[PDB]
Amino acid sequence: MSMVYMNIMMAFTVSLVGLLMYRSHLMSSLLCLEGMMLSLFVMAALTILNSHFTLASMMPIILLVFAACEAALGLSLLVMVSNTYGTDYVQNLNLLQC
């Protein structure tokens, strides 16, 4: 494959590792989730644009819209967590251990 794909695929891999390796802030992990979508948007757009797949030009928009809507849902849950505990730390979300 072309050289650009190497970096876009690295970016997805980096943000995926960032997503799976939490620290404390739930917010910092949501950003990694949005980073994953951004790299998917770019890789999809590059593949579609370069190949002149005309009708697929709308696909990156649908990706962005649905992922932003899912990000709104994630942010809403974070706010409800912050209301319960006063922080978005993931270590407070361990009640269901038992």
Partner: protein, 175 residues
């Protein structure tokens, strides 16, 4: 060097990702993503995606990321720890840039590297199309077709956005 604009931008793209993926304070995490998004739009522009590129700025940066920063201020951070002042954050950041540097080193030197997939390092320009003389933008024509070809897509996408409004009001009411 301008003939490798796409590759240079994609290197900056990865560096920004290593930025927020090492997960500094959320305030600076949003900054890394904003820069990555802006660079990401730049890459899409250089493939002929002018409308798609500007959507990133309008919707991803001017919309989604504004709301992230808005929420971060209210619910998460008000002041940040100094970037790269933490052991794990700095170690993760150093590790990412070393991996990126070596990928870039071998791809440029051997003109090819191989990790899961085979990548060629001749230059992204070599794959471009050599025939263009229509009186319109193909990208714009494809996006405009959403309303003629994509009736079903509009319905489900429209329904999901409406349900999003309903769901988020349900979630946040608290009773």
């Amino acid at each position: 060097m301008m003939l490798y604009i796409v590759f240079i931008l994609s290197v900056i793209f990865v560096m920004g990702f290593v930025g927020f993926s090492s997960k500094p304070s959320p305030i600076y995490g949003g900054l890394g993503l904003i820069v990555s998004g802006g660079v990401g739009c730049g890459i899409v522009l250089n493939f002929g995606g002018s409308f798609l590129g500007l959507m990133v700025f309008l919707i991803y940066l001017g919309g989604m990321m504004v709301v992230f920063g808005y929420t971060t201020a209210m619910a998460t951070e008000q002041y940040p720890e100094i970037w790269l002042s933490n052991k794990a954050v700095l170690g993760a950041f150093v590790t990412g840039l070393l991996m990126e540097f070596f990928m870039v080193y071998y791809v440029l030197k051997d003109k090819e590297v191989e990790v899961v997939f085979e990548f060629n390092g001749l230059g992204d320009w070599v794959i471009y199309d050599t025939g263009d003389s229509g009186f319109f933008s193909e990208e714009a024509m494809g996006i405009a077709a959403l309303y003629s070809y994509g009736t079903w897509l509009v319905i489900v996408t429209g329904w999901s956005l409406l349900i999003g409004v309903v769901v988020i009001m349900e979630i946040t009411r608290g009773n």
